[PDB]
Amino acid sequence: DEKEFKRLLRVRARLKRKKPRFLRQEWWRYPKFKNDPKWRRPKGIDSKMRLKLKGKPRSPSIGWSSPKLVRGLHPSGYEEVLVHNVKELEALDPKRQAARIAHTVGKKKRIEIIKRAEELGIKVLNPR
């Protein structure tokens, strides 16, 4: 249902706008962590983030997951497919799939891919 699809897209957008960036504890304190922003579970005996105290950064949990129907979709609503040539481009569904050209593809092949996508009616996320 298109109405349910749109409602779940809005729900996912709001949820992921509210979601914070889960980062390792004391990431800001050292360049060795600030230059490599990741999340690591705090495991110390006296770790406040492990204790989940208020006033401290939160931790990832299963509840933050997107609704199943629109999980992983492009914000435009299409499903991204990574394409490396015209043969892979021609296998997409123009009604519900979008093409993302691989970063490694050169200009000579990208021109042909873009032309084929335009004449097939397939959306391209990164047109050159």
């Binding site: 249902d1 699809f5 199943k68 129907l69 999980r71 992983g72 296998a91 569904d93 519900r96």
Partner: protein, 92 residues
């Protein structure tokens, strides 16, 4: 919701092989008899001379990939297609 990506004819064998996708958001994987009936009705196939080779569901996707064959005649069916597929499809 059936979208046929590919249809190819094999005269050396005498069959039409169809690769298609079933788009079923919020619904279970369609049954083999339902898929056969829909495909036969839409493509104007001979129901006693066609089999569904496979239907595959891939993780959290609502699009299942189906491969089916439609032979020219029951003689070709019994000559090429094997016994277990014939029992599964109920054409024997």
């Amino acid at each position: 919701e059936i979208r046929i990506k590919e249809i190819k004819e094999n005269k050396l064998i005498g069959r039409k092989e169809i690769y298609f996708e079933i788009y079923h958001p919020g619904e279970p994987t369609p049954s083999r008899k339902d898929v056969k009936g829909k495909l036969v009705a839409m493509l104007d196939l001979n129901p006693e001379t066609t089999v569904i080779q496979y239907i595959r569901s891939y993780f959290g996707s609502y699009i299942s990939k189906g491969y089916a064959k439609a032979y020219d005649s029951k003689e070709r069916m019994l000559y090429i297609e094997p016994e277990y597929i014939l029992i599964r499809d109920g054409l024997i």
